[PDB]
């Protein structure tokens, strides 16, 4: 199809290689939060790339919200420099994209109950609990959120081609259960 899912979020991990004093980081980094009574990490944000970082005492870090592999790595590097400039002997090691989320619109209503019954082995649909159908694909190990409006959410990918392939696999099934 000429429909290609749009990437909405990417999560990554990086090892800085040193231990950090979270309070020092907090007191010296702009736009940073540190509340050990809520979450044992420093939450830090930057505008470009617009992302959020969970920095830890172990030197472990998680970066979220990026919409491209390039942005994800770039932001991660920015947080790294900021930590280094504060005085910590940080390094940028083992950068790894752990999850990629995507979404698309097929532009036609979908018969969810029908979809669920035909593909019961993969489908979960309790509209009273949640309005979308939870379809767990085995092929590319991807989880899709199918809605009666024709909008799709695809998540759990290590690389974008998985999101892409997961949609190409599901598309025929969507046409198969089009409600019009």
């Amino acid at each position: 199809s000429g429909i290609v899912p749009t990437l909405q979020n990417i999560v990554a991990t990086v090892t800085l290689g040193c231990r950090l004093d979270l309070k020092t980081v907090a007191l010296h980094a702009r736009n940073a939060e540190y509340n050990p009574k809520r979450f044992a990490a420093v939450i830090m944000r930057i505008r470009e790339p617009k992302t959020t970082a969970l920095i830890f005492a172990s030197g472990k870090m998680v970066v979220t919200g990026a919409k491209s592999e390039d942005d994800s790595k770039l932001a991660s590097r920015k947080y790294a420099r900021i930590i280094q400039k504060i005085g910590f002997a940080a390094k940028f090691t083992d950068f790894k994209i752990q999850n990629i989320v995507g979404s698309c619109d097929v532009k036609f209503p979908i018969r969810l109950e029908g979809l669920a019954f035909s593909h019961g082995t993969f489908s979960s649909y309790e509209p009273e609990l949640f309005p979308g159908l939870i379809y767990r694909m085995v092929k590319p190990k991807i989880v899709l959120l199918i809605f009666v409006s024709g909008k799709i959410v695809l998540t759990g990918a290590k690389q974008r081609e998985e999101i892409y392939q997961a949609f190409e696999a599901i598309y025929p099934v969507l046409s198969e259960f089009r409600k019009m």
Binding site: N31, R45, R47, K50
Partner: protein, 46 residues
Amino acid sequence: ENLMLCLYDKVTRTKARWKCSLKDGVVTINRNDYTFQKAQVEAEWV
């Protein structure tokens, strides 16, 4: 020099929109001083 000293009741955020419920404070804005019981802050981060 445009400094507000006070207490916070609640601070929240949704996307880049922050809201703050401030109490019992004093501010100096443009060489003038104000004292307040309550204050609400609606600010958009980028």
